[PDB]
Ligand binder design. Structure first.
Ligand SMILES: O=C(O)CCCC[C@@H]1SC[C@@H]2NC(=O)N[C@@H]21
Ligand SMILES: O=C(O)CCCC[C@@H]1SC[C@@H]2NC(=O)N[C@@H]21
Lengths: 322, 322
């Protein structure tokens, strides 16, 4: 329905109070009975809405599905992002982003409940299942030299880890340069790309997938042991909207650090969070493949690694498996 | 008309011979009189087509306007580019490119007779006048590390200079890192951008403007002395299609060098072509502005410059004025 979102927006915008059939009806300027219709549908979609006669309606709990209207109430109150785009299903949130950012300077982000052609590093396939995870791309506009990309990744990583962690009862670590783990479960992968040119950056596009509500029964055969959702590590139900809120809060925070700090200022912190140490690693380099021990992250965000032949490298990136 | 292009294509594809009303009519499968209609229109648009009874039609000369159909006969015969997009008018060939390259790996390019929101380095305004210049963006897919961008620029520059030069009676020089001059006239500016990410490059987008057919009367007040079109330096009329052909030929050539050479291998050549030496230069650096002498291009494509206080810098880029 045309007003379903406007109605939702009034409900959320109005917690923790009830609002009347009539109140709302006046605001959108439509019959009160048109409102009953909207609400019964919303309920029927799985919204917890308390309706008491004489008092009105209280939005209690939202479904594992994304609503533009309520997300708008996020971008409004935000002083990082201009706007956002919300989708039920879509080729890729990244694709969409890389399109939507041309010929403008907006900072914004994009959510989908499901991706059909969702991809990870190296045009890998990324499973984006309906209503199970956060599948989001994030466009930012930091005016810095293109080389600075790699630094961004490092900062965001902690941002992402932190948000996830606030909801996990188990240890959320980072697996440089792009993976967030909980114990042995990839809870999240994330991809930092950019459009840029010698004279600096046109935009940063951070694609983030975070597994939210999966049960091991949900993961393909090819991965079932090294994947874990936030829910397998939270005692209570994980509210996809509650989480989103903290995650932006954190993505933001971390971004300004990115913009006003060197790497060193978070370096140690980042170290204490990595789970790549003292264990053997399987690096892969188009054609080439080999092993090695991760020995340190230098001031500059490079991984220093003693390979299996005692030979010492400095990598800005890498493709690592355990 | 629906078949105007298909008809053009047959004409071009058939030089230096005539083809009949009937011949063509059979090929597209439409009445011969539908053909007369097409041709008279084409003529009326300014095509030189020789029609002799009993013999048929010979395409002699094309207008200062771009035809998809004939451009297709270029991408077909090309083993660099997959396809191309041709427009009468458009926001930007670059914008268009940055859109069209998402979610695919095509190598292709885009022409417009006129840009409305045509832009140069630094979101500068770029005058793209109807039927007067080559306004083209070029998407390539060289799998290399993102750092390699700057090297591409260097190679292309010579490519561009060469093509232009084959038609100039005057000295076509380069003004690192992005401008092609003839004497004191900017004949062409060109912008190299990319979409990429730590693990290498998603695409290279080279935006190229080249002034073709302008008379000093055509240039705004704000620039009339330091701008020149290829035509002011060619004795004969400059055939925008003849030129395009050489230019791709050259853009290609130069690109493979880019992919199979170091910079040094063309370094000296590039030097002999620059016009930045032994003259004072006005560098500009957001807020800062200062002077200096260009003293050398190092093996790595960096400009070495003695500034006005004897202080020595290595720039990968710069913003320079005379
Ligand atoms: O490869 C990885 O390790 C992580 C990939 C990141 C996936 C995110 S989900 C949001 C998004 N949209 C995409 O098309 N890919 C991603
Ligand atoms: O700023 C310069 O010195 C040169 C700019 C390059 C202009 C090319 S024309 C093709 C194209 N499309 C654009 O939007 N800009 C350019």
């Amino acid at each position: 329905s045309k007003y379903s979102q406007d109605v939702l927006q009034l409900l959320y915008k109005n917690k923790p109070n009830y609002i009347s059939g009539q109140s709302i009806a006046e605001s959108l300027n439509i019959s009160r009975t048109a409102v009953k219709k909207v609400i019964d549908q919303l309920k029927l979609e799985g919204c917890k809405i308390d309706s008491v006669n004489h008092k009105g309606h209280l939005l209690q709990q939202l479904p594992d599905i994304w609503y533009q209207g309520i997300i708008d109430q996020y971008t409004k109150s935000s002083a990082l992002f201009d706007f956002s785009e919300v989708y039920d299903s879509i080729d890729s949130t990244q694709l969409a982003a890389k399109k939507s950012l041309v010929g403008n300077q907006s900072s914004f982000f994009i959510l989908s409940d499901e991706q059909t052609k969702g991809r990870g590093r190296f045009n890998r396939h990324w499973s984006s299942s309906k209503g199970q995870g956060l599948w989001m791309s994030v466009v930012l506009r930091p005016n810095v030299a293109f080389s600075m990309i790699s630094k961004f990744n490092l900062f965001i990583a902690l941002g992402i880890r932190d948000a996830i962690q606030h909801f996990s009862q188990d240890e959320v670590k980072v697996k440089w340069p792009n993976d967030i783990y909980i114990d042995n479960g990839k809870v999240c992968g994330f991809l930092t790309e950019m459009v840029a040119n010698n004279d600096g950056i046109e935009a940063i596009i951070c694609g983030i997938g975070i597994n939210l509500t999966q049960q091991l029964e949900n993961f393909d055969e090819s991965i079932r042991h090294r994947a874990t959702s936030i829910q397998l590590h939270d005692k209570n139900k994980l509210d996809r909207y509650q989480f989103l809120e903290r995650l932006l809060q954190e993505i933001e925070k971390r971004y300004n650090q990115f913009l006003t700090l060197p790497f060193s200022e978070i370096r140690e912190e980042y170290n204490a969070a990595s789970n790549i140490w003292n264990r053997t690693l399987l690096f892969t380099e188009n054609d080439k493949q080999f092993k090695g021990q991760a020995i340190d992250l230098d001031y500059d965000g490079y991984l220093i690694v003693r390979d299996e032949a005692g030979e010492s490298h400095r990598l800005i990136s890498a493709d690592i498996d355990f």
